[PDB]
Structure formats: structure tokens, C-alpha cells
Design a protein around this ligand. Structure first.
Ligand SMILES: *[C@@H]1O[C@H](CO)[C@@H](O[C@@H]2O[C@H](CO)[C@@H](O[C@H]3O[C@H](CO)[C@@H](O)[C@H](O[C@@H]4O[C@H](CO)[C@@H](O)[C@H](O)[C@@H]4O)[C@@H]3O)[C@H](O)[C@H]2NC(C)=O)[C@H](O)[C@H]1NC(C)=O
Ligand SMILES: *[C@@H]1O[C@H](CO)[C@@H](O)[C@H](O)[C@H]1NC(C)=O
Ligand SMILES: *[C@@H]1O[C@H](CO)[C@@H](O)[C@H](O)[C@H]1NC(C)=O
Ligand SMILES: C[As](C)(=O)[O-]
Ligand SMILES: [Ca+2]
Ligand SMILES: [Ca+2]
Ligand SMILES: [Ca+2]
Ligand SMILES: [Ca+2]
Ligand SMILES: [Ca+2]
Ligand SMILES: [Ca+2]
Ligand SMILES: [Mg+2]
Lengths: 452, 440
């Protein structure tokens, strides 16, 4: 249960690389446990910010980790009459990392792309891109569902239809248990937001080194809309998967659109064919409801529940004033073909500007009492404002309104302690789930162990 | 009968006055050479004293100059009078105390500062006339409400970073409109063009020389501009003693905090000034947009009233943001300026000033006390400050001067004037110690 805040392990990366911006547990083709760490500002041998990934093996001492190698140089290829070109400068490789059994997946949301044809171009824009790696065999593959070869002028005549030029694919990501990679592209369709997915096996098999624009046959992307409510919504700013329609044969997606309906924010449950199942709207504009989205069964009833962060939520203090503290929302799944009603519980921050709800990670069953628990980040929380992660335990009606444990930041100011979190994995192998906390502002990742 | 003036009577007329304000004298020989020479006035009358040789000074303090408080300012404000009795001569005997009056009226116009924030993005093209007219009509409306104004303005578009900014072809960096076969200025976050000044005609010429730029996404970085125009004291030129109005314009949505991640920007807004020599917001490409909360905090911290002049297609949206930031009004920007101008009128009518008296240069051997009477006419002793008064309102104070003995300074003067005013009450103090040459 109690995560020891003294014999905690520290891991580190280069200065300014924002090591710990993203992270995940890697259970390799072998069996030990490692920590994939993304550092989106890591310098390339060319001395330009291209980003980078680090694979950290478990060791109570911590420290430096080997770098996970990836192609860091620009590509240019001529196919017929077009010059296809990719730009990796400030692409932010590792702004999003995620391991799925054998393979690791890192993404560069900001990698630019362009196509030239005579005196017309398509534009240089952030289509983003994900790099797939199988550390054992040293193999690599790539997936960039948003690259296109349509010239600028065509979009202007189509009135910007199906414009995936600014996708920022891989901005956020998840892999279902069955091995389907799901990418969140908040810039998709001219800033509406889109989601793209394909089976990791098919991504690897269809990839050909040298081809820059290809179609992964078994892939599918969300849709463009003319409904104003979706305009500038950033649908895909965050994603998650889970079981929500009762049919265990089908998996559903949870997408965050923090700026939906004129900054009102929203979260949606969709099937694998992107057909809508439900929509949780937010309660306050600019609160960023949808920033984070977690899935887990917090009350032991056998059905997945939903957690939504709105880090910018301004709370109603006494005397007609408001205070930005952040807030999380719990939605329990009511059994059968039934709609998720209002919030079953409202956890809300206390420290001003702490951005509570900024990150939500489902721990396993910390205390082993048969009820799953969760951890919520407030990167700028605490009296000092150095950040702090709060642990909330699984009850029977939802969760305890009170934090059972409050982990404070061992790092200086601006560490952004908590911005990324990942739990529910036995790293030390003591039959108990642990918690990793990234602090990109300090370039470090802290490891908290579960002890008896 | 035996009284304190007699119990200590010694030998001089002067010494008799130095005993107490109530003591008198009598240099009349017609009195028995053993009777009370120093005593009360009534006691000296019963002792048969000639009312000619009696020396019984009294404190008076006369009003020298005192032209009434005026009732206007339009035409020519030469030197107007908003204080009562500008000069009084206070003459008092040892240890005595004389009380006088003074009253002020707020006659001068309230100092007002307006800073215009122009959305100069491409979607503003068809609105450019409207915001120029408004900016011009702004300086007019205020100038009619207050002869004391300092107007200025700045412009914004968005963060000069992909994907907001067009970064291809190479000509697009200098001319974003290049792709459309037309031409516009290069993109910029926020630019401070005209510091607050009283030169209205120069403000109007400058505002009309403004043209649009281009950006890719509808939402803009107006909030980056509101933040900067708020926290850059010296740059903007806000004058601390005055009312601060910040009019903001736009015809579209806006970027709120956490949007910057699409530009690779994650550092939360530090809420500090970043407009250097070049008059540009330098953090534009490295710092995120500010959140509603940070804005509110800063707006209050600097006492700035935010006003939204926005197009009708986005009015509801700004009304909703208006509720999340208290004390902010919203007007609908268009060719017709009636609406947004009302908000400027209202803001003025809500201004309140205060009369707080201060005492400069008063002898150490002299002390004052005040009895204030504010709006509600409720007299409260000790207090010398009134609040909540509009233009024209009048407030009065009762002052009492007290001395300790008889100073060798025989001629002095001090001033009592309210802060934020120029009109003062000068008091000439004269200490009457010596007698009319009485000898015995
Ligand atoms: C500015 O703020 C105002 C105040 O909130 C916004 O107006 C409100 O917008 C609501 C939509 O977001 C709108 O609908 C809701 O309330 C209605 C009350 O009559 C009601 O008809 C609706 O009921 C149903 O809601 C379910 C969702 O659970 C839907 O599935 C149904 O189809 C119905 O819509 C909604 O509960 C509400 O009426 C409205 N209230 C006001 C004050 O006008 C406004 O949109 C904001 N403008 C913007 C975009 O900035
Ligand atoms: C001065 O004070 C006396 C009593 O203290 C009072 O009778 C008189 O009205 C006052 N004079 C003034 C300044 O109005
Ligand atoms: C002020 O008022 C008090 C009581 O109301 C009175 O005793 C005192 O003499 C007054 N002094 C002045 C300044 O008029
Ligand atoms: C964002 As625009 C179309 O006003 O430059
Ligand atoms: Ca299912
Ligand atoms: Ca449940
Ligand atoms: Ca538990
Ligand atoms: Ca463990
Ligand atoms: Ca317009
Ligand atoms: Ca914009
Ligand atoms: Mg615009």
C-alpha cells in the first residue's frame, strides 16, 4: 500500500532534454521489467532538438540509461513528379511513449512534412509520426497515417476537406490488449482532431524502408465533421481504451477533446468503428476537461469506470470569487445497455495553479483489499508549488474523497513533478504494484515502491 | 473664589498669560496694592478694574482668502478652487486652542487611461474599418468625459510558430498572403505600437496606418496580449493614480492555456513582462498562453478593467468568459460604435475618489485633531478621510489646533491638503505672548 518516499529510486537524462515527459513499463520479449522514458528535446548528433527515447532496466540505484536508437536524420525521396520530404527538427520524439508486450512505440507529434510538385507544394506541416521498435531484434518500423500528397491548391478548392496536414499524430497514444495501436491527432481535419489506428503486426509487415508515403491496409481513421461543436476541439488530445458496452468481444475508445464546443470540453466513448456511444460534456469553459483520461474498475464490480481530468477547473471560493485548482471526475459504469450518468464523485484540487487532474494513472490494487486504486498528479501543487501526486483508494461506491497518501516532489521548482505517471506494474517483483513519476522539468524520473 | 490664576501670580503681565488661557491682567493703579493682579475677567470686574488697562487676549484665526468651490471645468481650467479657505491667519495665546473649518469638493475630472488592443489577423480584414473607427471614436468619447486622458494601443495575431504560422514557401515568412497572390505583413504575437500619451491626433493617425497579417487557425493569441498589456508597467505607460481601461477586440475564438502544446510549448505562463526594446512579446514562442485565473489575478493586481469589443458571431462566447473573470464588461464591435462606447461611459460613472488630508510642515510644538463629516453627514471624531465620492460631491472637516506654551518662533505656517489634489489650505500661525506693554 504505502509507497516509500525515502528509499525511492532516481533515473536521469541529459540537461534540457525534458527526460520523463512521457513513460511506460516495458515487459520485454524476455521477462524482466524496464521503464521506457521519452525525452522530446534530446539533441541529435547534428546538435539540433530531435528528441529521443531511453530504455531503463530496473536497478534500485538508478541513474543513466542506454538510448533507444531511432532514425534522426531528414528524408527526401522522389516518386514520379513529386519530391516527398520529412523534417525532424524539433519533432519531439518521445513526447509520447508506450510499450505493448514485445514492442515499444515512440512518437514525434511535431515532425513536419511536405511534398513538392513543380511550382506547387502541399505545405510544410506537422503531420507527426510514430516510430515502432522491437529492442530484442533491434528492428524498426514507422507509422505516419497523416502524410499526404495533395497540393495546397486542391484543399483551397475542396474548402479544406479531410485535411490531415496538421494532425500531430502520436500526440497521445495507447495500444489495446489485442495489439491495435491507437494514435491521437488533435490537429487532424483542420484542428477538429482525429484518431488513427492499425495493428502493430500490420504496421511492421507493411512497412518498407525507403517508402515515405504508404497505406497500412488494416488501418482506420476517425471522420471529418461540419458540425461547429467540433471546431478546434482537439479531439484526440488524450486517449484510453476499455470495455464499456458490455460486449467483451469488442473494445471501445475514450477520447479527450479539451476544447470541444467553444472550450466547454468533452470526452467520448466510441466503438472501434468510431461510432459514438456516449459523451461527457464539461461543466466549466477553459477548464480543459479531457486533458487526461483514465480507465479502471475502482469499486470492484467487474466493470470499467472512467476518470477525467480538468486541470484548469476554477473552483467556487467564498465571496463571489473563483480559484484555479483543477478537478477530476469519476463516472462509474452502470450495468448493461445503459448510459453513464452524471459524475459519481468530484475530487478537486486545493493548491492554486497546481493543475490538479493534469495526469491520472490507474495503480493496481495497492492495499490488496480487492479494490483498484488511482494516483492523481498536480504538477504545480503543494504549499511550495513543487508538485505532488495524490493517491485515492478504491471504495465500494467509488473512491475515497480523501487522499490516503500524498507524495511530494523531491525536485526543485518547475520540475513539473507528476506531468506523467504510470502504475499497476510489479517492477521490483514483490507481488505489489509500483508507481513511476516523470518530472521532465528536472530531466528525471522517480520510482516509488510498494512495500508489504 | 481663589482661583488658579491667583495662586501663582508672580510679577509680569506676560507670566500671567503663560499660566492659563483663562487668566487676565490689569495694569490699573486704582487697585489696592495687595489685590489680585492676575485673575479671571469677572473677578477683575468685581475688584473694580478699568476695562482699558485689562489685557485679556483671545485666539481667533481669521479667514483671509476663500472663494467658493467651482461647478465646472469645460472651457478653460485656469486654476480652479476645490478647497475651502485657502489661507487663514491663526493667532493664539500660550497653551490655547482655536478651531477652524475646511471643506473640499471633487471638481477636477478623473484621470483615465485607455489601451486599445487590435486583433490584426486576416479574418479581421473585413473588420479593419470598424476597429479603426472604434479606436478613433474611443479617444473622442473619453475626451468628452474627461479633459485628462492618456490613450495608446497595441496589436496581436498569434504565436509565430507552426502550425499557427505558415512556414512555407520561403516567401510566406515575409508575406503570409503570398499563396493568395495578395500581400500582407509578416506574422507576430503581440506588438506594442503606441505608448500611452495625451497626443490624441497622433493616436488617430497611427491607428489608421494599421493593416492585417495572416495565420492558419481561427483561434488567436489575444490573451497573450491582454496579459502583456497588463503586466508591463513602464512599457504601456499606465499612470498609477488613474483609472485603467483595457479595450480588447476580435472577431473570432481565442487560445486559452494548454493550447500551446500543439506548438510544442509546455512552459506555463509566468505572468511577467516580456516586451523588450523591440516592443515585441519575446516569450510568444516559448511560453504557453495564460489561463483565465492568471489573467484575473493580474488584472486585479494592476487595477485594470478589461472590456471586450467583439463581433456578434462570438459575443456569447465572450460573455461566458466574462462571467469567469468578474468586473469585465462585453460590447459588440461593429461599424456602429454606440454599444462598445457605452461600456466606456459606464466605467467612468463607476469611478470613486477619496479625500485624505495630510499635514505638511507643522511646528513640533503644535498638534491637530479632526472631526470628519462624509456623505452620510455622520460626524466621526479623530477621522480625516472620506471615501466613495463622485464628481461635484462635497465633504467637510473640523480642525482644532493646540499649542504647548509660547514658542520663540513668533511667525510660522503650515499646510493641510488632500492627496491627489493641488489646492491646499495654508495656515499662518502667530503666537501672541507679550502683553500690551504692561508695567508696575
Ligand atoms: C454560454 O453559456 C451558456 C450557459 O451555459 C450556454 O447555454 C447553455 O448551453 C446548453 C448546451 O451546452 C443548453 O442546453 C442545455 O440546457 C437546455 C436547457 O433548456 C437543455 O435543452 C439541454 O438538455 C439536453 O441536454 C442533453 C445532454 O445531457 C442533450 O442530449 C439534449 O439534446 C438536450 O440538449 C441542455 O441540458 C442550455 O439551454 C443553454 N442555457 C442557456 C443559459 O442558454 C451557451 O451555449 C454558451 N455559449 C457558448 C458556446 O459559449
Ligand atoms: C469651534 O469650536 C467651538 C467649540 O469647540 C464651536 O462652538 C464652534 O462652532 C467652532 N467653530 C467653527 C470652526 O465652526
Ligand atoms: C470634535 O468633536 C468632539 C466631540 O464631538 C469635541 O469634543 C471636540 O472639541 C471637537 N473638535 C473639533 C476639531 O472640532
Ligand atoms: C487566423 As486569421 C484567418 O484571422 O489570420
Ligand atoms: Ca465491448
Ligand atoms: Ca466499476
Ligand atoms: Ca486497493
Ligand atoms: Ca512492487
Ligand atoms: Ca471578420
Ligand atoms: Ca490563430
Ligand atoms: Mg483571426
Amino acid at each position: 500500500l504505502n509507497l516509500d518516499p525515502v528509499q525511492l529510486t532516481f533515473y536521469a537524462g541529459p540537461n534540457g532534454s525534458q527526460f520523463g515527459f512521457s513513460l511506460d513499463f516495458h515487459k520485454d520479449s524476455h521477462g524482466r521489467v524496464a521503464i521506457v522514458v521519452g525525452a522530446p528535446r534530446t539533441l541529435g548528433p547534428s546538435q539540433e532538438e530531435t528528441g529521443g527515447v531511453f530504455l531503463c532496466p530496473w536497478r534500485a540505484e538508478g541513474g543513466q540509461c542506454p538510448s533507444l536508437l531511432f532514425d534522426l536524420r531528414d528524408e527526401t525521396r522522389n516518386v514520379g513528379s513529386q519530391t516527398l520530404q520529412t523534417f525532424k527538427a524539433r519533432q519531439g520524439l518521445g513526447a509520447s511513449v508506450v510499450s505493448w508486450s514485445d514492442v515499444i512505440v515512440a512518437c514525434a507529434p511535431w515532425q513536419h512534412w511536405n511534398v513538392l510538385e513543380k511550382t506547387e507544394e502541399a505545405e510544410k506541416t506537422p503531420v507527426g509520426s510514430c516510430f515502432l521498435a522491437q529492442p530484442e531484434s533491434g528492428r524498426r518500423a514507422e507509422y505516419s497515417p497523416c502524410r499526404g500528397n495533395t497540393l495546397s491548391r486542391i484543399y483551397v478548392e475542396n474548402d479544406f476537406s479531410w485535411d490531415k496536414r496538421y494532425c500531430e499524430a502520436g500526440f497521445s497514444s495507447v495500444v489495446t490488449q489485442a495489439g491495435e495501436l491507437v494514435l491521437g491527432a488533435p490537429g487532424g481535419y483542420y484542428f477538429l482532431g482525429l484518431l488513427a489506428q492499425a495493428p502493430v503486426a500490420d504496421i511492421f509487415s507493411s512497412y518498407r524502408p525507403g517508402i515515405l508515403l504508404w497505406h497500412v491496409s488494416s488501418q482506420s481513421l476517425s471522420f471529418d465533421s461540419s458540425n461547429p461543436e467540433y471546431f478546434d476541439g482537439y479531439w484526440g488530445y488524450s486517449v484510453a481504451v476499455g470495455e464499456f458496452d458490455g460486449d467483451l468481444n469488442t473494445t471501445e475508445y475514450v477520447v479527450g477533446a479539451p476544447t470541444w464546443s467553444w472550450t466547454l470540453g468533452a470526452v467520448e466513448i466510441l466503438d472501434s468503428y468510431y461510432q459514438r456511444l456516449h459523451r461527457l460534456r464539461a461543466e466549466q469553459m477553459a477548464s480543459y476537461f479531457g486533458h487526461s483520461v483514465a480507465v479502471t474498475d475502482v469499486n470492484g464490480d467487474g466493470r470499467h469506470d472512467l476518470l477525467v481530468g480538468a486541470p484548469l477547473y476554477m473552483e467556487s471560493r467564498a465571496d463571489r470569487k473563483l480559484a484555479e485548482v483543477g478537478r477530476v471526475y469519476l463516472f462509474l459504469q452502470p450495468r448493461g445497455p445503459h448510459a453513464l450518468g452524471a459524475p459519481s464523485l468530484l475530487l478537486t484540487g486545493t493548491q492554486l495553479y497546481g493543475r490538479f487532474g493534469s495526469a491520472i494513472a490507474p495503480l493496481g490494487d495497492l492495499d490488496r483489499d480487492g479494490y483498484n486504486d488511482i494516483a492523481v498528479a498536480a504538477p504545480y501543487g503543494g504549499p511550495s508549488g513543487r508538485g505532488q501526486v495524490l493517491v485515492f483508494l478504491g471504495q465500494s461506491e467509488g473512491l475515497r474523497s480523501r487522499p490516503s497518501q500524498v507524495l511530494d516532489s523531491p525536485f526543485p521548482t518547475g520540475s513539473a513533478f507528476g506531468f506523467s505517471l504510470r502504475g499497476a506494474v510489479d517492477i521490483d517483483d514483490n507481488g505489489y504494484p509500483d508507481l513511476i513519476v516523470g518530472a521532465y522539468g528536472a530531466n528525471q524520473v522517480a520510482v516509488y515502491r510498494a512495500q508489504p | 473664589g481663589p482661583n488658579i490664576c491667583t495662586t501663582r501670580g508672580v510679577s509680569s503681565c506676560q507670566q500671567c498669560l503663560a499660566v492659563s488661557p483663562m487668566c487676565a491682567w490689569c495694569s490699573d493703579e486704582a487697585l489696592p496694592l495687595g489685590s489680585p493682579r492676575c485673575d479671571l475677567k469677572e473677578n477683575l470686574l468685581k475688584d473694580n478694574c478699568a476695562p482699558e488697562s485689562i489685557e485679556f487676549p483671545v485666539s481667533e484665526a481669521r479667514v483671509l482668502e476663500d472663494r467658493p468651490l467651482s461647478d465646472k471645468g469645460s472651457g478653460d481650467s485656469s486654476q480652479v478652487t476645490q478647497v475651502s479657505p485657502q489661507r487663514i491667519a491663526l493667532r493664539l495665546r500660550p497653551d490655547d486652542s482655536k478651531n477652524f473649518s475646511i471643506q473640499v469638493r471633487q471638481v477636477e475630472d478623473y484621470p483615465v487611461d485607455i489601451y486599445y488592443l487590435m486583433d490584426l489577423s486576416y479574418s479581421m480584414k473585413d473588420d479593419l474599418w470598424s476597429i479603426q473607427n472604434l479606436g478613433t471614436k474611443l479617444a473622442t468619447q473619453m475626451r468628452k468625459l474627461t479633459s485628462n486622458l492618456r490613450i495608446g494601443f497595441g496589436a496581436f495575431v498569434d504565436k509565430p510558430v507552426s502550425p499557427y504560422m505558415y512556414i512555407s514557401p520561403p516567401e510566406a515568412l515575409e508575406n503570409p498572403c503570398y499563396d493568395m497572390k495578395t500581400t500582407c505583413l509578416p506574422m507576430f504575437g503581440y506588438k506594442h505600437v503606441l505608448t500611452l500619451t495625451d497626443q490624441v491626433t497622433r493616436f488617430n493617425e497611427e491607428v489608421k496606418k494599421q493593416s492585417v497579417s495572416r495565420n492558419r487557425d481561427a483561434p488567436e493569441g489575444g490573451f497573450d496580449a491582454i496579459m502583456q498589456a497588463t503586466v508591463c508597467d513602464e512599457k504601456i505607460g499606465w499612470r498609477n493614480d488613474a483609472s485603467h481601461l483595457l479595450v480588447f477586440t476580435t472577431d473570432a475564438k481565442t487560445h486559452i492555456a494548454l493550447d500551446g502544446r500543439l506548438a510544442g510549448i509546455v512552459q506555463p505562463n509566468d505572468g511577467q513582462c516580456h516586451v523588450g526594446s523591440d516592443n515585441h512579446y519575446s516569450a510568444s514562442t516559448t511560453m504557453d498562453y495564460p489561463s483565465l485565473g492568471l489573467m484575473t489575478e493580474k488584472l486585479s493586481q494592476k487595477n485594470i478593467n478589461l472590456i471586450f469589443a467583439v463581433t456578434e458571431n462570438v459575443v456569447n462566447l465572450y460573455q461566458n468568459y466574462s462571467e469567469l473573470i468578474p468586473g469585465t464588461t462585453v460590447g459588440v464591435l461593429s461599424m456602429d460604435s454606440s454599444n462598445v462606447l457605452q461600456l466606456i461611459v459606464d466605467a467612468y460613472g463607476k469611478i470613486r475618489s477619496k479625500v485624505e488630508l495630510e499635514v505638511r510642515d507643522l511646528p513640533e510644538e503644535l498638534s491637530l485633531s479632526f472631526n470628519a463629516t462624509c456623505l452620510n453627514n455622520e460626524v466621526i471624531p479623530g477621522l480625516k478621510s472620506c471615501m466613495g465620492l463622485k464628481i461635484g460631491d462635497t465633504v467637510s472637516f473640523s480642525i482644532e489646533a493646540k499649542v504647548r506654551g509660547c514658542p520663540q518662533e513668533k511667525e510660522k505656517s503650515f499646510t493641510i491638503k488632500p492627496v491627489g489634489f493641488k489646492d491646499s489650505l495654508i495656515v499662518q500661525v502667530t503666537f501672541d505672548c507679550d502683553c500690551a506693554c504692561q508695567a508696575q
